[PDB]
Design a protein around this ligand. Structure first.
Ligand SMILES: OC[C@H]1O[C@H](O[C@@H]2[C@@H](O)[C@H](O)[C@@H](CO)O[C@@H]2O)[C@H](O)[C@@H](O)[C@@H]1O
Ligand SMILES: OC[C@H]1O[C@H](O[C@@H]2[C@@H](O)[C@H](O)[C@@H](CO)O[C@@H]2O)[C@H](O)[C@@H](O)[C@@H]1O
Lengths: 729, 729
């Protein structure tokens, strides 16, 4: 190709104006095969310039000068200057050196992590460049490990500046797009490390129904299999493939009962101890792999081995799938060691994700992160987080930052996994985040005390958790449409603020704030409430524009950074003027696609929303106060329209237009009501409540209302009253 | 042998069902010679199974699957699964990787350590396996360094589960048993880094006699030799082999005076600066080693050199031994560097211990730890600890943990060596520990202020120190018998609780608690007293059974964890019902073996004790209330019997039986007396003392006495009163 240049023992491939592959080969042969990371090097032709001399070469694109002075790659022989001025002297890449600016990516797991842990670099940098080293093995055409690359150094130089979304799109072109999730993945999951019986598990599922909590997935953790019943001469019961018959005397009947309740079923698989001689599938595996059964030779875990993988999928997973298991929870914690040098977690995720496609369309796994490109094998499973405010306070940042290495379907244990401390408010705040996260999977440790059941908690916490869990199912249309946009267009559901606002310094200073799809901006509260206010808080950056609280309609004039206060039952979620958000009107109703959609419209600007579905596309347009709904294909679906406050149209069938110009634009939210509520719940002196209510009611000029609150001895009460005055300005 | 298997470039020797030697050789030759660590690979034949294929081999014992997939040893090619379930997923060894569970071993020294330091691994693991790498040089038949092993990798896989005692016994079979100590090593040692004269040293020894403090050993520290008198052109006076004639004008006469007082004599040797031209032995060494005397060529320290070692033993140590020096204090702090790659400390301990056997039977050294197998060269010398509560609080744990690498004769500086802070209570608590430690050597720094003389302190501390120092000599029969059991049966004097109680979680949660021989359990107090109670405390785990305070007879019903309180003059030491402890009746009497033994019997169960001596064995049996004493050989020895409280038999000669069924079983210890004493010393309000004494005397029901103390505002006073109520239940 014209986009390929060889010089000395190096090869340079200009894939885009902003993406260059850099290779070294001692043998003069360069690698064309796919790798664990890279699935596609076919990119459209681009323009660039070369200065080639006897001893040096310079490649020049719109954004980078790449220099190579010959010989082995060193920090002196191979380096690049970006054509940007984001920094004063951090604009140069040197081979093998780190530079400042990397916005980070993700890491394997949150196992044993209490609050923050270090992350790996991503492809995004504030200074406009990043290098992604390909250190993986080569694949065969069908996707088996083929061995070592002939490109003994193989690098990707990203020089996208702050065009983060295009960097991610081209990353997906190189490493392959995320597959589409199935709709069931986007609902509530129930999970608990608890030794349920068939009877007590179904009783709990029927209790969820009675309690008005919708579920899409039934996880069965490791007590599904033999544990204490495993003879100690075999080792532990951690790995198992044999039903505990006391708890599950008829597995297929139990899974049929979950299927009748419209639940998808997954089992915990700890693969590391393989198939030992006590297991129900051992006789078939032993025959297939020619094991010495009289010496009880184990089929040790070996995912490098084709015969082992075949026996694992066909003779170990196969019978369980025949009993009705829908997909696999791969729960690997036993290290990165294999004869091939390929991480066993990568081999599991790559091969299990492929195998899952045989029994179901668009199937998933649930497994830990296995390095760049492992977004091809959703879903991510972050694992055994410590239950703490610190862990919750890290998790939104962790989740949005992961989009910087394209790993956009993290499923966290909602409420935290293990250890840590009880606080029903922490559980409630964690569920609020989970509902506005990629995946909402409730899960917990082997403790008698860590159940995430809403009715574990008092009546106030229970009702709020049920409300948020119902909200998750109202959001499934929005989530599923965003899912198809991840798969087809390479856009993350969860974006850091700096994707949309790359030149705003405040977009780098609100770590836990994120865009959730294209219509909603989320600022979860991740700190214990101030008991004097009976409210939690978070500093929100409002971009330019008019913003509304998604729930209350409280308005905010951007651009501003403003501390916002919410009771423990309320979450800061915001929509711009013109936002249109579809909601399922019947989130409890078991139906493959919603029979009724609520179109929730935020007044004050034009907008539009495209609802992508399995078998349809529905466009909602809001232009000069006219709201129109059209679909590719006709259906019996009934549309409800909510314009700000008021339901305008109920259950209208087919395509239509309606003029909202003559309809009430304003939400109910008002300063006086909100003020009374904040003063009333506050654990402060009644004389202070009386004086604040009286003075803020009497003083007419906004600047003097602000001067009055500025004299308050309670600094946080000042900030709370200021938020109300700012919204009421 | 049938217990030897070769595969690819590896050799496997199944030594026991639980011990496998693993070797790699590039040359196809494997190492049969002894190493610095390994003295014996002759073990009885055991049964095991092999699965041998073209490309892989599995060795199967009762406790382990060892796997080798061929090629170089890597974490992927060489690994093992234990046949235990102590952990859920820590049951696999990978070559070159660390696993969880190791209970630790020891380290070279406590030089400069204030409190805790890291330890090396031992052979004991809660998860049931450990690997001991042999990285040492090979020896010749006579025990000189021969060079590099032909087994370029040589490992021992221990898979004993929690059978810690058998692991240690088989370690001793592999590395050689600890030699027997001489009886004199088990008495009190006097030492001080102080420039005594012959006259002032003998005056101090005669003061010990006047003060009723028995001593076995007289240490003379480095001021025995020239120090400030060394010309600076030679370097320092740290190394020396020449008596300071001002302080010791007639060395042989001074050593004769110590010998007349029945003291063994050792001198400090700092070897690192060798024999320089100013030294008294230099002319003879210079002639032997062909040194250039007109250029004053030093005989530099070189323990790799046979001629240097010979000149060191014969011409440097030899003349000092002729003057009466009994054994060598090797005080090496100058690093691990030698041309051979053998640690100079190992060469010193190995060769000096061997050389010490020429002049005396069962002789010792005193030197720092030199790695696994260096237990062959007792005694251990921990060195220059910082004087602090933190150092004392580490030391019992340090001492018992060392049994996990078979190094069971640590001698710590009792009271701490240097720096740190004065606190007479710290000195007293440290001596209490020392008396119940492997070796009781009083030692201290060059400070005018750090003498460990009891009469340095006030009358209360002095009398308590004298009492404990007399107790050490009462314990010599018990210690000497345990010493012969270390040498012949591979059982440590000091054991961690988990040797006796491997399946009790509490046996892993009391770091400073230990078994001391087979009859006594020790819980030293290592924290400054609570001034409100005038008592120190430690949480004691009492195993199942009835336990008695060794000193008071206070009873405790196991199994329980209970905070116990003692005045600064009292130490928590416990014996089970049926315990029999021999004591020397005449600890001050200079005699090679005791003329009188007290048999101290704890009522409530059967028991027995075997007293091993130089030239006898005496069995004490307590069966259905009949106490019998028999001996292999007859003697004039007089036996005293103490049954609980009461001396039953005084000074009875020869073998005999006596029926104690009709004798008072109960100790005097009573709740009311102990209660009055604790309230009386407490620095609390007299109104509180009055109310506690009155209410605990009046309230009859035990549960209501406990409810009464539960209301006390002093939380530690609650725990102290609770200990008394628990003992009085
Ligand atoms: O399948 C059970 C459980 O396994 C993993 O978590 C474990 C955790 O619950 C346990 O406390 C620790 C202690 O060893 O080990 C694992 O981390 C898995 O992450 C979790 O989701 C499962 O519920
Ligand atoms: O022989 C004297 C002394 O030497 C060693 O301890 C030294 C110590 O007392 C001194 O303060 C420091 C400072 O350099 O050096 C050595 O650690 C030896 O450990 C000790 O037992 C001796 O008493």
């Amino acid at each position: 190709n014209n986009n390929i240049i060889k010089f000395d023992k190096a090869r340079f491939t200009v894939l885009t104006e902003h993406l260059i592959r850099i290779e070294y080969s001692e043998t003069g042969e360069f690698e064309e095969r796919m790798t664990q990371m890279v699935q596609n090097r076919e990119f459209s032709e681009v323009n660039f310039d070369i200065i080639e001399k006897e001893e040096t070469i310079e490649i020049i694109t719109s954004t980078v000068h790449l220099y190579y002075n010959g010989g082995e790659f060193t920090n002196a022989s191979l380096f690049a200057d970006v054509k940007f001025n984001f920094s004063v002297y951090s604009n140069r890449w040197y081979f093998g050196e780190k530079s400042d600016g990397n916005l980070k990516g993700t890491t394997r797991t949150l196992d044993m992590i209490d609050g923050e842990c270090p992350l790996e670099d991503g492809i995004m940098s504030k200074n406009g460049f990043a290098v992604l080293a390909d250190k993986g093995k080569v694949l065969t055409e069908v996707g088996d490990i083929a061995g070592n690359s002939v490109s003994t150094i193989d690098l990707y130089l990203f020089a996208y500046g702050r065009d983060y979304r295009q960097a991610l799109k081209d990353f997906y072109q190189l490493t392959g797009n995320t597959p589409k999730l199935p709709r069931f993945a986007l609902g509530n999951w129930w999970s608990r490390y608890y030794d349920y019986s068939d009877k007590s598990y179904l009783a709990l599922m029927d209790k969820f129904t009675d309690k008005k909590v919708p579920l899409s997935v039934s996880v069965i953790d490791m007590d599904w299999h033999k544990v204490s019943e495993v003879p100690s001469r075999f080792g532990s019961g951690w790995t198992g493939y044999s039903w505990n018959k006391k708890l599950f005397p008829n597995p297929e009947n139990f899974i049929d009962e979950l299927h009748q309740r419209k639940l998808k079923v997954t089992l915990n698989d700890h693969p590391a101890d393989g198939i030992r001689a006590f297991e129900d599938p051992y006789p078939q595996v032993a025959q297939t792999l020619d094991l010495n059964t009289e010496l009880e030779e184990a089929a040790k875990f070996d995912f490098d081995n084709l015969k082992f993988r075949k026996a694992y999928f066909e003779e170990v997973h196969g019978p369980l799938e025949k009993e009705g298991v829908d997909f696999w929870w791969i729960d690997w914690q036993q290290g990165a060691i294999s004869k091939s040098g390929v991480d066993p977690l990568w081999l599991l995720n790559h091969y299990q994700y492929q195998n899952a496609q045989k029994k179901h369309k668009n199937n998933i796994i649930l497994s830990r992160y296995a390095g760049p490109g492992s977004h091809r094998y959703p879903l991510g499973f972050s694992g055994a987080s410590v239950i703490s405010w610190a862990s919750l306070d890290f998790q939104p940042y962790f989740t949005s930052t992961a989009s910087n290495i394209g790993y956009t379907w993290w499923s966290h244990d909602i409420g935290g996994h293990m250890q840590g401390y009880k606080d029903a408010e922490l559980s409630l705040r964690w569920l609020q985040f989970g509902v506005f996260s990629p995946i909402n999977r409730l899960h917990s440790s082997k403790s008698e005390f860590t159940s995430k059941e809403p009715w574990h908690f008092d009546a106030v916490i229970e009702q709020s958790m049920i409300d948020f869990l119902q909200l998750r199912h109202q959001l499934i249309p929005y989530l599923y449409s965003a899912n198809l946009i991840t798969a087809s267009e390479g856009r993350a559901l969860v974006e850091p603020l700096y994707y949309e606002y790359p030149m705003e310094e405040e977009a780098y200073q609100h770590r836990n704030q994120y865009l959730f799809g294209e219509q909603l901006m989320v600022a979860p509260i991740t700190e214990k409430m101030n008991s004097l206010l009976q409210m939690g808080s978070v500093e929100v950056w409002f971009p330019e524009g008019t913003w509304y609280d998604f729930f209350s309609g409280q308005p905010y004039d951007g651009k501003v950074s403003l501390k916002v206060y919410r009771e423990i039952t309320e979450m800061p979620v915001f929509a711009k003027a013109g936002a249109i958000i579809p909601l399922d009107k019947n989130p409890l109703k078991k139906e493959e696609i919603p029979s009724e959609i609520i179109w929730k419209i935020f007044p004050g600007a034009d907008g539009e929303y495209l609802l992508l579905e399995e078998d349809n596309e529905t466009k909602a347009e809001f232009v000069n106060g006219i709201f129109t709904v059209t679909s590719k294909k006709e259906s019996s679906r009934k549309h409800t329209i909510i314009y700000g406050e008021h339901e305008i149209v109920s259950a209208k069938r087919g395509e239509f237009s309606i003029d909202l110009n003559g309809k009430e634009e304003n939400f109910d939210w008002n300063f006086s009501t909100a003020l009374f509520r904040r003063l009333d719940i506050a654990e402060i002196s009644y004389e202070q409540k009386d004086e604040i209510l009286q003075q803020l009611s009497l003083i007419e000029e906004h600047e003097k209302q602000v001067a009055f609150i500025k004299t308050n001895e309670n600094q946080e009460l000042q900030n709370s009253l200021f938020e109300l005055l700012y919204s009421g300005k």
